[PDB]
């Protein structure tokens, strides 16, 4: 049946039909909802339907469904899956595929941009060195001197499982994390393991806070190799505060380019285990999560101290005050250095606009309320009051296991 | 189906194991192909049938005697055969006082959207099943409010009116809360008071209420007994504890002229125990600050004060990226907590409350094998990720006894 979703602030009601075309499972059941579980729940005969479905979908998009080309392209794909146990996507299909994985990303508040995506075909890559080269080109293009641009670079699809391409970094640019003799942590705690894997491999670490990690690239299922990103390609922003002159002293900085490199892109039955993609930052990702999470840089106490705040009882909301200041700083800083960034008010407004567009032109838009609502000031953004349906459309970005758990050196 | 289910806390890596979900009863609205976790209510005046009723009653009795370590006892079987006969000969049955108190506490304990459940076992239950008139209802309700309020040291309580019978004799509180402020739509198009209550206010005025037409007017009680038209009663003002809102630092904050009531008491939900439906069951607890400070005060379709507070804070309001809305939000929520604490009216901040719930949830997993929670509701409307629940995986499912939603009575009521 058609489903209706309502905004409770504006009483706008949209009708969702698109959900009827999903085929992947969500993890919920009639009796249990798992909407807050982070990660819930081929062969040639498995492959051809998955393949057929995506091609039908592709030619449907270009309004040439059932055409000569379409008939023939299907013939070509089956024949290929027989004779080669797989198949290869056309360039046009590849671009269509990557843009719609973004469009189908239920957790991404930024999807108003989904069709402005630069797609870098790297399926001819054969070595970690080749990988390093394609990645430097990606970073240079995406960073673009501060005027950031959305891109993805796509390495060869998975074959037999043992000749797999993987960027071992979770992001191309991340800060190192070191575990002190103290039991304390220097830098980013999120990356303590990975930083140790790099050190074991030969990386001589600066053992400072914000040390850019090297790349760890695995090509065709071989051991990963270390590479230094040329420092001139790594754009960073020193965080300062428009009113608090002492905020300079905290010594904080973050990188400009958010580039997830550990997810898996699935198009037409094919699995791209190496497909780093990038956009630009919503301020809260840095100012709330990276800086203020307890398992991360955890700066609230330090900042609230410098603000001379009363910190003895929780009901002074001292944590809440310090939080808004830190995020004011992040936004002020990026903006001053002409580095692209977005605040959560503007981002969430844009996503509501995006939702309207998609309900109008597509009959729905999969959305994960848990992930779309910003981690601060939730109910004073429009998405808090917006009902969303979540469901799983393909092509898509999927999670995959960490490489160090599967790889035998 | 899987017997065991794991949930993880991504801040502390603590993993819990849920078995209780196996006793889930009703639909969530979600399927395997779609999740409706952010839908507010995922969806005739007729009643349960004999055959529908025994298993609902049997399930609840078994559950009750298992709770008091007397499962399989002669008392258990005597209760089963007694209830069975009552149903077979009168098409319904009556709960013992002990079963009704058990049932009520457990409906709270099962409420997946409630963050305050650590208190579930301390709940004063008022049995009002002997009530027959609206005047009687008003009397029962006044005693509830007085007891719960307790001069500011609030105590949670529920008053339970007679259960449903044929569905033409329902008892209903028409108010959505026992205590709320009126909303008045101007010809201007503007709204005086609380816009959320504009419809119910128009019903009261139509029924005969003489509105003061001010910003914070306490609404009359509109009470229906035994299927009859509802009747207006004014709550004695000395029973309505209120708190003026001031700010520890900004001396001008009082000039805003804000106040809120101390006692949150919900009166439009249906309580369901062993297949019986109590359509009138007002229950009350005490506030978490964000409820007033964020939703009541700053929601755009509510009192919507963020701009005015900003202006007096002398904040740059030309760009959203100044986060002026965010700065003012926090200060508003500070004032609210400051005011209630000063007037010694019970209230809990969102940090304490969520931390307590995490503890409650863990205990529930160990002693009960689960604790249904609704993440979308449990996480507070401001400062989400800096509270522990943000990072906590939750399973949501419906256990009975339960508090449910029900249609507004004016949409249904056949007027005598
Ligand atoms: C262009 C500006 C963009 C903005 C402002 C944006 C914003 C966001 C934010 C705030 C999140 C939540 C991240 C978190 O809290 O962990 C997210 C998630 C996500 N984004 Fe976007 N994004 C952008 C571009 C892109 C692009 C170019 C792609 C892919 C081509 C993409 C795909 C995704 C996916 C798959 C997730 C979910 C990640 C996960 O499940 O772990 N986004 N985005
Ligand atoms: C004693 C302190 C209590 C606190 C701090 C508390 C806190 C809360 C909060 C903050 C909500 C979210 C409501 C909203 O945002 O609109 C909620 C929901 C709820 N609470 Fe509690 N509560 C308390 C007592 C109780 C009691 C005594 C009961 C029942 C016996 C109860 C049952 C519920 C139910 C059924 C909901 C869901 C409301 C709905 O679905 O509309 N609570 N609670
Ligand atoms: C397993 C896991 C996974 C993730 C995924 C985090 N993804 C962050 C992300 C991913 C992509 C982004 C993109 C594409 C743009 C942007 N501005 N921010 C982005 C932020 C986070 C925490 C955990 C954990 N634990
Ligand atoms: C349909 C609807 C329903 C509700 C119900 C809100 N119930 C709020 C509530 C209910 C019970 C509480 C209790 C028992 C204690 C407390 N501190 N706060 C409580 C708050 C709110 C908004 C909408 C809307 N739209
Ligand atoms: C348990 C819960 O799923 C987890 O903490 C989620 C909640 N929502 C989130 N939302 C965003 N945008 N990013 C996140 O990492 C998370 N984490
Ligand atoms: C669309 C969404 O379900 C709705 O706005 C919810 C979100 N979470 C909430 N959480 C609480 N505690 N109270 C609410 O009213 C809401 N509203
Ligand atoms: Zn669900």
CSV table of C-alpha atoms in Angstrom, one decimal, chain A residues 43-350:
chain,number,residue,atom,x,y,z
A,43,UNK,CA,27.4,-17.0,-7.9
A,44,UNK,CA,26.5,-16.9,-11.6
A,45,UNK,CA,22.9,-17.8,-11.0
A,46,UNK,CA,22.6,-15.4,-8.1
A,47,UNK,CA,24.3,-12.8,-10.3
A,48,UNK,CA,22.3,-12.6,-13.5
A,49,UNK,CA,19.0,-11.4,-11.8
A,50,UNK,CA,20.8,-8.8,-9.7
A,51,UNK,CA,22.4,-7.8,-13.0
A,52,UNK,CA,19.2,-7.8,-15.0
A,53,UNK,CA,17.5,-5.7,-12.4
A,54,UNK,CA,20.1,-3.0,-12.4
A,55,UNK,CA,20.2,-2.8,-16.2
A,56,UNK,CA,16.4,-2.6,-16.5
A,57,UNK,CA,16.6,0.2,-13.9
A,58,UNK,CA,19.3,2.0,-15.9
A,59,UNK,CA,17.5,2.0,-19.3
A,60,UNK,CA,14.3,2.9,-17.4
A,61,UNK,CA,16.2,6.0,-16.2
A,62,UNK,CA,17.2,7.1,-19.7
A,63,UNK,CA,13.7,6.4,-21.1
A,64,UNK,CA,14.8,3.7,-23.4
A,65,UNK,CA,13.3,0.7,-21.6
A,66,UNK,CA,12.7,-2.3,-23.8
A,67,UNK,CA,14.7,-0.7,-26.6
A,68,UNK,CA,17.1,-2.3,-29.1
A,69,UNK,CA,20.1,-1.2,-27.0
A,70,UNK,CA,18.4,-2.5,-23.9
A,71,UNK,CA,17.6,-5.9,-25.3
A,72,UNK,CA,21.1,-6.2,-26.6
A,73,UNK,CA,22.8,-5.0,-23.5
A,74,UNK,CA,21.0,-7.8,-21.6
A,75,UNK,CA,22.1,-10.4,-24.1
A,76,UNK,CA,25.7,-9.2,-23.7
A,77,UNK,CA,25.6,-9.3,-19.8
A,78,UNK,CA,24.2,-12.9,-19.5
A,79,UNK,CA,26.7,-14.3,-22.2
A,80,UNK,CA,29.4,-12.6,-20.2
A,81,UNK,CA,28.3,-14.1,-16.8
A,82,UNK,CA,28.4,-17.5,-18.5
A,83,UNK,CA,31.7,-17.3,-20.1
A,84,UNK,CA,33.5,-15.3,-17.5
A,85,UNK,CA,31.4,-16.0,-14.3
A,86,UNK,CA,31.0,-12.1,-14.0
A,87,UNK,CA,30.5,-9.0,-16.1
A,88,UNK,CA,31.8,-5.5,-16.6
A,89,UNK,CA,29.8,-2.3,-16.4
A,90,UNK,CA,29.8,0.3,-19.2
A,91,UNK,CA,31.1,3.7,-18.2
A,92,UNK,CA,27.7,5.3,-18.3
A,93,UNK,CA,26.3,2.5,-16.1
A,94,UNK,CA,29.2,3.0,-13.6
A,95,UNK,CA,28.5,6.7,-13.3
A,96,UNK,CA,24.7,6.1,-13.0
A,97,UNK,CA,25.5,3.4,-10.4
A,98,UNK,CA,27.7,5.5,-8.1
A,99,UNK,CA,25.3,8.5,-8.1
A,100,UNK,CA,22.3,6.4,-7.2
A,101,UNK,CA,24.2,4.7,-4.4
A,102,UNK,CA,24.5,8.2,-2.9
A,103,UNK,CA,20.8,9.0,-3.7
A,104,UNK,CA,19.8,5.8,-1.9
A,105,UNK,CA,21.9,6.4,1.2
A,106,UNK,CA,19.3,6.6,3.9
A,107,UNK,CA,21.7,8.1,6.5
A,108,UNK,CA,23.1,11.0,4.4
A,109,UNK,CA,21.7,14.4,5.1
A,110,UNK,CA,23.7,15.8,2.1
A,111,UNK,CA,21.9,14.0,-0.7
A,112,UNK,CA,20.4,17.2,-2.2
A,113,UNK,CA,23.8,17.1,-4.0
A,114,UNK,CA,23.6,13.5,-5.2
A,115,UNK,CA,23.8,14.2,-9.0
A,116,UNK,CA,26.7,16.6,-8.8
A,117,UNK,CA,29.2,13.7,-8.3
A,118,UNK,CA,32.6,13.4,-9.9
A,119,UNK,CA,33.2,9.8,-10.8
A,120,UNK,CA,36.8,8.6,-11.2
A,121,UNK,CA,37.0,5.2,-13.0
A,122,UNK,CA,40.0,3.3,-11.6
A,123,UNK,CA,39.0,-0.2,-12.7
A,124,UNK,CA,42.3,-0.6,-14.6
A,125,UNK,CA,44.4,-0.3,-11.4
A,126,UNK,CA,46.6,-3.3,-10.6
A,127,UNK,CA,49.0,-2.2,-7.8
A,128,UNK,CA,49.1,-0.3,-4.5
A,129,UNK,CA,51.3,2.3,-6.3
A,130,UNK,CA,48.6,2.7,-9.0
A,131,UNK,CA,46.1,3.0,-6.1
A,132,UNK,CA,48.1,5.7,-4.4
A,133,UNK,CA,48.2,7.6,-7.6
A,134,UNK,CA,44.5,7.5,-8.2
A,135,UNK,CA,43.9,8.6,-4.6
A,136,UNK,CA,46.2,11.6,-4.8
A,137,UNK,CA,44.4,12.7,-7.9
A,138,UNK,CA,41.0,12.3,-6.0
A,139,UNK,CA,42.2,14.3,-3.0
A,140,UNK,CA,43.6,17.1,-5.2
A,141,UNK,CA,40.5,17.3,-7.3
A,142,UNK,CA,38.0,17.1,-4.3
A,143,UNK,CA,39.9,19.6,-2.1
A,144,UNK,CA,40.1,22.1,-4.9
A,145,UNK,CA,41.9,24.8,-2.9
A,146,UNK,CA,39.1,25.0,-0.4
A,147,UNK,CA,36.1,25.0,-2.7
A,148,UNK,CA,35.5,21.3,-2.2
A,149,UNK,CA,33.9,19.0,-4.8
A,150,UNK,CA,32.2,15.7,-4.4
A,151,UNK,CA,34.0,12.7,-5.8
A,152,UNK,CA,34.4,8.9,-5.6
A,153,UNK,CA,37.2,6.8,-7.0
A,154,UNK,CA,36.3,3.2,-8.0
A,155,UNK,CA,38.9,0.4,-8.0
A,156,UNK,CA,38.4,-3.1,-9.6
A,157,UNK,CA,35.3,-5.1,-8.5
A,158,UNK,CA,35.7,-8.2,-6.3
A,159,UNK,CA,36.5,-11.4,-8.1
A,160,UNK,CA,37.1,-14.6,-6.2
A,161,UNK,CA,37.4,-12.9,-2.7
A,162,UNK,CA,41.1,-13.4,-2.5
A,163,UNK,CA,42.2,-10.8,-5.1
A,164,UNK,CA,40.5,-7.8,-3.4
A,165,UNK,CA,41.2,-4.1,-3.4
A,166,UNK,CA,41.0,-2.4,-0.1
A,167,UNK,CA,41.9,1.0,1.4
A,168,UNK,CA,42.7,0.0,5.0
A,169,UNK,CA,42.2,3.5,6.3
A,170,UNK,CA,38.6,4.3,7.3
A,171,UNK,CA,39.2,7.7,5.8
A,172,UNK,CA,41.9,9.0,3.5
A,173,UNK,CA,42.7,11.7,5.9
A,174,UNK,CA,42.6,10.8,9.7
A,175,UNK,CA,44.6,11.7,12.7
A,176,UNK,CA,46.8,9.1,14.5
A,177,UNK,CA,46.0,7.8,18.0
A,178,UNK,CA,48.7,6.7,20.4
A,179,UNK,CA,48.1,4.9,23.7
A,180,UNK,CA,50.4,6.5,26.4
A,181,UNK,CA,52.3,4.7,29.2
A,182,UNK,CA,49.8,6.6,31.3
A,183,UNK,CA,47.0,4.5,30.0
A,184,UNK,CA,46.0,7.8,28.5
A,185,UNK,CA,45.6,8.5,24.7
A,186,UNK,CA,47.4,11.0,22.5
A,187,UNK,CA,45.5,12.2,19.5
A,188,UNK,CA,42.4,10.5,18.1
A,189,UNK,CA,41.4,7.4,20.2
A,190,UNK,CA,39.2,6.1,17.4
A,191,UNK,CA,42.3,5.2,15.4
A,192,UNK,CA,44.6,3.7,18.0
A,193,UNK,CA,44.5,0.3,16.5
A,194,UNK,CA,45.1,1.4,12.9
A,195,UNK,CA,47.9,3.6,14.1
A,196,UNK,CA,49.6,0.6,15.7
A,197,UNK,CA,49.2,-1.5,12.5
A,198,UNK,CA,51.0,1.3,10.5
A,199,UNK,CA,53.8,1.6,13.1
A,200,UNK,CA,54.3,-2.2,12.9
A,201,UNK,CA,54.6,-1.8,9.1
A,202,UNK,CA,57.3,0.8,9.3
A,203,UNK,CA,55.6,4.2,9.8
A,204,UNK,CA,57.8,6.3,12.0
A,205,UNK,CA,55.1,8.3,14.0
A,206,UNK,CA,55.6,11.9,15.1
A,207,UNK,CA,53.8,10.9,18.3
A,208,UNK,CA,51.9,14.1,18.5
A,209,UNK,CA,48.2,14.9,18.5
A,210,UNK,CA,47.1,15.7,15.0
A,211,UNK,CA,49.5,13.6,13.0
A,212,UNK,CA,48.1,12.8,9.5
A,213,UNK,CA,48.2,9.0,9.1
A,214,UNK,CA,49.9,7.3,6.0
A,215,UNK,CA,47.8,5.4,3.4
A,216,UNK,CA,47.6,1.6,3.7
A,217,UNK,CA,46.8,0.3,0.3
A,218,UNK,CA,46.0,-3.3,-0.7
A,219,UNK,CA,45.9,-4.2,-4.4
A,220,UNK,CA,44.6,-7.4,-5.9
A,221,UNK,CA,44.6,-9.2,-2.5
A,222,UNK,CA,48.3,-8.6,-1.7
A,223,UNK,CA,49.9,-7.2,1.5
A,224,UNK,CA,49.1,-3.5,2.0
A,225,UNK,CA,51.8,-0.9,1.3
A,226,UNK,CA,52.5,2.4,3.1
A,227,UNK,CA,52.4,5.8,1.3
A,228,UNK,CA,52.7,9.4,2.5
A,229,UNK,CA,50.1,11.8,1.1
A,230,UNK,CA,52.0,14.8,-0.2
A,231,UNK,CA,51.5,17.4,2.6
A,232,UNK,CA,50.6,20.1,0.0
A,233,UNK,CA,47.5,18.1,-0.9
A,234,UNK,CA,46.2,18.0,2.8
A,235,UNK,CA,44.1,21.0,3.6
A,236,UNK,CA,43.8,21.8,7.3
A,237,UNK,CA,42.0,24.5,9.4
A,238,UNK,CA,43.2,26.0,12.7
A,239,UNK,CA,40.2,26.4,15.0
A,240,UNK,CA,39.7,29.8,16.6
A,241,UNK,CA,36.7,31.6,18.1
A,242,UNK,CA,35.3,35.0,17.0
A,243,UNK,CA,34.9,36.3,20.5
A,244,UNK,CA,37.1,34.1,22.8
A,245,UNK,CA,40.6,35.2,22.1
A,246,UNK,CA,41.9,32.3,24.3
A,247,UNK,CA,40.4,29.7,22.1
A,248,UNK,CA,43.5,29.8,19.9
A,249,UNK,CA,45.4,28.4,22.8
A,250,UNK,CA,43.5,25.1,22.9
A,251,UNK,CA,45.6,24.2,19.9
A,252,UNK,CA,42.9,22.5,17.9
A,253,UNK,CA,42.8,21.9,14.1
A,254,UNK,CA,41.0,19.6,11.8
A,255,UNK,CA,41.3,18.6,8.1
A,256,UNK,CA,39.0,20.0,5.4
A,257,UNK,CA,38.2,16.9,3.4
A,258,UNK,CA,36.0,14.1,4.7
A,259,UNK,CA,36.6,11.0,2.6
A,260,UNK,CA,35.2,7.6,3.6
A,261,UNK,CA,37.3,4.8,2.3
A,262,UNK,CA,36.2,1.7,4.1
A,263,UNK,CA,32.7,1.1,2.7
A,264,UNK,CA,31.6,-1.2,-0.1
A,265,UNK,CA,29.8,-0.1,-3.3
A,266,UNK,CA,27.3,-2.6,-4.7
A,267,UNK,CA,26.1,-2.1,-8.3
A,268,UNK,CA,24.2,-4.7,-10.4
A,269,UNK,CA,25.5,-7.6,-8.3
A,270,UNK,CA,29.1,-6.4,-8.4
A,271,UNK,CA,31.1,-5.6,-5.3
A,272,UNK,CA,33.5,-2.7,-5.2
A,273,UNK,CA,35.5,-3.2,-2.0
A,274,UNK,CA,37.6,-0.1,-2.7
A,275,UNK,CA,35.6,3.0,-3.5
A,276,UNK,CA,36.6,6.0,-1.4
A,277,UNK,CA,34.2,8.9,-1.7
A,278,UNK,CA,34.1,12.4,-0.4
A,279,UNK,CA,32.0,15.6,0.1
A,280,UNK,CA,32.3,18.3,2.6
A,281,UNK,CA,31.7,18.7,6.3
A,282,UNK,CA,28.6,19.5,8.4
A,283,UNK,CA,30.1,21.4,11.3
A,284,UNK,CA,28.7,19.1,14.0
A,285,UNK,CA,30.6,16.0,12.7
A,286,UNK,CA,33.7,17.8,13.9
A,287,UNK,CA,32.6,20.2,16.6
A,288,UNK,CA,30.2,17.7,18.3
A,289,UNK,CA,31.3,14.2,17.5
A,290,UNK,CA,35.0,14.3,16.8
A,291,UNK,CA,35.9,16.9,19.4
A,292,UNK,CA,33.3,16.2,22.2
A,293,UNK,CA,32.6,12.4,22.2
A,294,UNK,CA,34.1,10.7,25.3
A,295,UNK,CA,35.7,8.1,23.1
A,296,UNK,CA,37.2,10.8,20.9
A,297,UNK,CA,39.1,14.1,21.6
A,298,UNK,CA,36.9,14.8,24.6
A,299,UNK,CA,37.6,18.5,25.0
A,300,UNK,CA,34.3,19.7,26.7
A,301,UNK,CA,35.9,19.8,30.2
A,302,UNK,CA,39.0,21.7,29.0
A,303,UNK,CA,36.9,24.3,27.1
A,304,UNK,CA,34.3,24.7,29.9
A,305,UNK,CA,37.2,25.3,32.3
A,306,UNK,CA,38.6,28.2,30.1
A,307,UNK,CA,35.1,29.6,30.1
A,308,UNK,CA,35.2,29.7,33.9
A,309,UNK,CA,32.0,27.8,34.1
A,310,UNK,CA,30.6,26.2,37.2
A,311,UNK,CA,31.1,22.5,36.6
A,312,UNK,CA,30.1,20.9,39.9
A,313,UNK,CA,26.4,19.9,39.1
A,314,UNK,CA,25.1,18.6,35.8
A,315,UNK,CA,22.0,20.9,35.9
A,316,UNK,CA,23.9,24.0,35.1
A,317,UNK,CA,24.1,22.6,31.6
A,318,UNK,CA,27.8,23.6,31.5
A,319,UNK,CA,28.4,20.8,29.0
A,320,UNK,CA,25.7,22.2,26.8
A,321,UNK,CA,27.1,25.7,26.8
A,322,UNK,CA,30.6,24.6,26.0
A,323,UNK,CA,29.2,22.5,23.2
A,324,UNK,CA,27.6,25.5,21.4
A,325,UNK,CA,30.8,27.5,21.7
A,326,UNK,CA,33.0,24.8,20.2
A,327,UNK,CA,30.7,24.5,17.2
A,328,UNK,CA,30.6,28.3,16.8
A,329,UNK,CA,34.4,28.1,16.6
A,330,UNK,CA,34.5,25.3,14.0
A,331,UNK,CA,32.0,27.1,11.7
A,332,UNK,CA,33.8,30.5,12.1
A,333,UNK,CA,37.2,28.9,11.3
A,334,UNK,CA,36.3,27.1,8.1
A,335,UNK,CA,34.4,30.1,6.9
A,336,UNK,CA,37.4,32.4,7.5
A,337,UNK,CA,39.8,30.1,5.7
A,338,UNK,CA,37.3,30.0,2.7
A,339,UNK,CA,37.0,26.2,3.2
A,340,UNK,CA,33.6,24.8,2.3
A,341,UNK,CA,31.4,23.8,5.3
A,342,UNK,CA,27.8,23.7,6.2
A,343,UNK,CA,25.9,24.2,9.5
A,344,UNK,CA,23.2,21.8,10.6
A,345,UNK,CA,20.3,24.3,10.3
A,346,UNK,CA,21.1,24.9,6.6
A,347,UNK,CA,21.9,21.2,6.0
A,348,UNK,CA,18.6,20.0,7.5
A,349,UNK,CA,16.6,22.7,5.7
A,350,UNK,CA,18.2,21.5,2.5
